[PDB]
């Protein structure tokens, strides 16, 4: 009822690095995919994620998230979940639209720091999944979309695990769910 999934191809196979494929390009195209998925899924419950419902960005009472600014030198900011996430999506889209960072042309190479950029992006995408599961799964159930959410999260976390792109300590807010979907 709650751990439902959709029909799909085998996701363990869909995240495997194809033969002869550059690892950076495989991370790039799946990162763009996963961002759009979590962006769309957060759009489904966005009217239930308000300033009053989520005064601080979190993943349950044990995991408070601050925003580490990339342009201003200041302590990571404690802010609401709508403010955190509405800025995260704009921030990630700018990285994906930047052709110095996520090149879409043939002869344009990836930067030396691409792997650190993509892992910062994927870390903050996880924080949106974690906030949805901990603070808005009730709204997810009212929209009858738990299978689509679980399948998107299953695909996303299988890719993170395939290439070890998020630290295990950061995955802690959903460790029980990761294990349940990966058995």
């Amino acid at each position: 009822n709650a751990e439902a999934t959709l029909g799909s191809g085998n996701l363990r196979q869909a995240v495997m690095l194809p033969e002869g494929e550059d690892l950076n390009e495989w991370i790039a195209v799946n990162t763009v995919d996963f961002f759009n998925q979590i962006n769309m899924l957060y759009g489904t419950i966005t009217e239930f994620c308000t300033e009053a419902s989520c005064p601080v960005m979190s993943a349950g009472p044990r995991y408070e998230y601050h925003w580490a600014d990339g342009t201003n030198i200041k302590k990571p900011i404690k802010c609401s979940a709508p403010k955190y996430i509405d800025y995260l999506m704009t921030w990630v889209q700018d990285q994906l639209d930047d052709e110095t960072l996520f090149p879409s042309k043939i002869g344009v190479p990836f930067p030396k720091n691409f792997m650190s950029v993509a892992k910062t992006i994927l870390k903050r995408l996880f924080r949106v999944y974690a906030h949805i599961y901990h603070q808005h799964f009730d709204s997810v159930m009212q929209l009858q979309e738990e299978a689509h959410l679980n399948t998107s999260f299953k695909h996303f976390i299988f890719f993170v695990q395939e290439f070890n792109l998020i630290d295990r300590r950061e995955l802690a807010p959903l460790q029980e769910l990761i294990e349940k979907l990966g058995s």
Binding site: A14, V32, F102, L143
Partner: protein, 520 residues
């Protein structure tokens, strides 16, 4: 035609200590009024509020006659559970609400009370347990109950409206003009709810099909309906006709066609991932609908609403249980219909359907393969509308792929364009199935050559009759020769490929990779 009279008799004859038997016949009658075309007399019967009337007796059990199929079922379940003395084995984690509803409806459909009383009470007990102890079910019941309570005055005003003043709705199978305006399809909000609600009048005289679908998992893709009731309208002749009026939330993001057009002015790398997000829902809906032995013959982007980024359907008048119907027994849009359907029509100048030909008297459609084609054309229209303001004149030409309208296609666009061609083959038995399509959507980020290999593993080319020519192109491609010396060992296979009544896309793709090697 008012076939409920033996159940009114049984209800009256039931002892009144046995209110479970009473409730069983009330729900049995209710299951039958939903399958019955209303005449003038049956309308006043189902709208009788004084004692001895249908509505008066449902109020006795706190059952709302205007409640949605699901909530009216749960209100019956609550009333029945107040009367059960032997409590079944409570097992909530082992219960499927759709399975309980389906088996309850089969009892109401054809089973007598003597043969099912105990199982009828336990099913309703289990349903009520979900309404009490399952947070998901409880909040659904709480929301629909509140909305139904706040819209009661509007419902009585609609029923209280004059018939000389009630609207006539003209018929048309289009979307360019849009939805016709009557007094009832006007958005509104209720105090405390930011989302707007809307009433819709459907073109049907009974909800027999609607009633079966709301007990199946596929109903997750239905816009949530909060109230249902039949209403008097004026016909073309002026006589009284009876149509259902359904209350639901207003879909706040228009439909899938408009969603694709908005992607034209966004980041291009978002197109293919968002198509995945939307078509994962379309594909799951189709498979879930097919699981109920129901089929959708009018699949097209603008027939799927989007509300809070959720793909939903509200036009279900066209659903059929017939997997092999004749062309005259289904409603569809000719622009997206497969050729097996178009070959049953006659056309005037410029190509407009004007009727059916001889073929319509015997030619049948395989609805699953029919749906695969239409799903393919939905993907093709979606892809194209992210690049062009209107659909091109060559949209139905299979030799003109969706990727041919992209100036700088990514690999995912190339892979999605190939899926379109696999779903829209001329021969229905050689089309990719929706299940195969569902498998391949998760591999769209693969390099095009690797994605083609994935298609071959899922849908082997031997099953298209092209295995003979696949080895002919592979033999030359596996050769060490290059340049013009390879081209004259590739000339015979090339000419054999130009003699194809419809070009097979899988051979058109392999011949090009072989043509490249010949040029040096």
């Amino acid at each position: 035609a008012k076939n409920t009279m033996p159940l009114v008799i049984a209800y009256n004859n039931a002892p009144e200590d046995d209110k479970i038997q009473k409730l069983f016949y009330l729900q049995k009658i209710n299951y039958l009024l939903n399958k019955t075309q209303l005449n003038d007399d049956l309308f006043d019967w189902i709208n009788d509020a004084e004692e001895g009337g249908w509505l008066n007796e449902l109020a006795k059990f706190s059952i709302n006659p205007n409640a949605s199929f699901f909530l009216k079922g749960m209100q019956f379940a609550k009333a029945i559970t107040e009367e059960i003395k032997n409590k079944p084995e409570i097992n909530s984690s082992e219960v499927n609400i759709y399975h309980l509803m389906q088996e309850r409806d089969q009892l109401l459909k054809e089973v007598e009370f003597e043969k099912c009383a105990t199982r009828y009470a336990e099913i309703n007990f289990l349903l009520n347990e979900l309404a009490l102890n399952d947070k998901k079910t409880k909040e659904i019941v709480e929301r629909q109950t509140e909305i139904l309570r706040l819209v009661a005055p509007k419902i009585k005003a609609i029923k209280g409206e004059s018939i000389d003043n009630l609207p006539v709705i003209p018929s048309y199978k289009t979307k360019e003009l849009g939805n016709h305006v009557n007094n009832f399809n006007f958005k509104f909000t209720m105090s405390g709810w930011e989302a707007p609600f809307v009433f819709r009048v459907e073109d049907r005289h009974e909800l027999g099909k609607e009633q079966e679908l709301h007990s199946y998992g596929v109903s997750k893709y239905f816009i949530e309906d909060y109230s249902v009731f039949m209403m008097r309208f004026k016909a073309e002749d002026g006589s009284t006709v009876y149509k259902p009026v359904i209350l639901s939330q207003f879909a706040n993001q228009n439909n899938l066609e408009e969603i694709a057009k908005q992607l034209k002015d966004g980041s291009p790398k978002n197109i293919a991932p968002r198509i995945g997000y939307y078509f994962v829902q379309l594909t799951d809906f189709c498979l879930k609908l097919i699981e109920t032995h129901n089929y959708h013959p009018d699949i097209k982007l603008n027939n799927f609403l989007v509300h809070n980024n959720r793909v939903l359907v509200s036009d279900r008048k066209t659903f059929t249980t017939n997997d092999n119907p004749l062309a005259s027994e289904i409603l569809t849009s000719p622009l997206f219909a497969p050729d097996e359907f178009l070959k049953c029509l006659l056309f005037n100048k410029e190509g407009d359907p004007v009727g059916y030909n001889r073929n319509a008297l015997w030619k049948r459609m395989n609805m699953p393969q029919f749906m695969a084609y239409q799903l393919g054309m939905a993907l093709k229209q979606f892809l194209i509308l992210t690049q062009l303001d209107e659909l091109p004149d060559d949209f139905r030409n299979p030799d003109h792929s969706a990727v041919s309208h992209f100036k700088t296609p990514s690999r995912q666009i190339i892979n999605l364009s190939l899926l379109v061609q696999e779903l829209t083959r001329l021969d229905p038995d050689k089309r990719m199935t929706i299940k195969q399509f569902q498998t391949l959507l998760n591999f769209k980020n693969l390099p095009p050559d690797a994605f083609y290999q994935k298609v071959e593993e899922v849908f082997p080319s031997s099953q298209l009759g092209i295995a003979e020519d696949i080895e002919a192109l592979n033999k030359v491609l596996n050769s060490d020769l290059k340049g013009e010396a390879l081209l004259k060992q590739a000339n015979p296979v090339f000419t054999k490929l130009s003699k194809y009544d419809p070009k097979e896309t899988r051979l058109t793709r392999l011949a090009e990779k072989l043509a490249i090697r010949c040029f040096n």
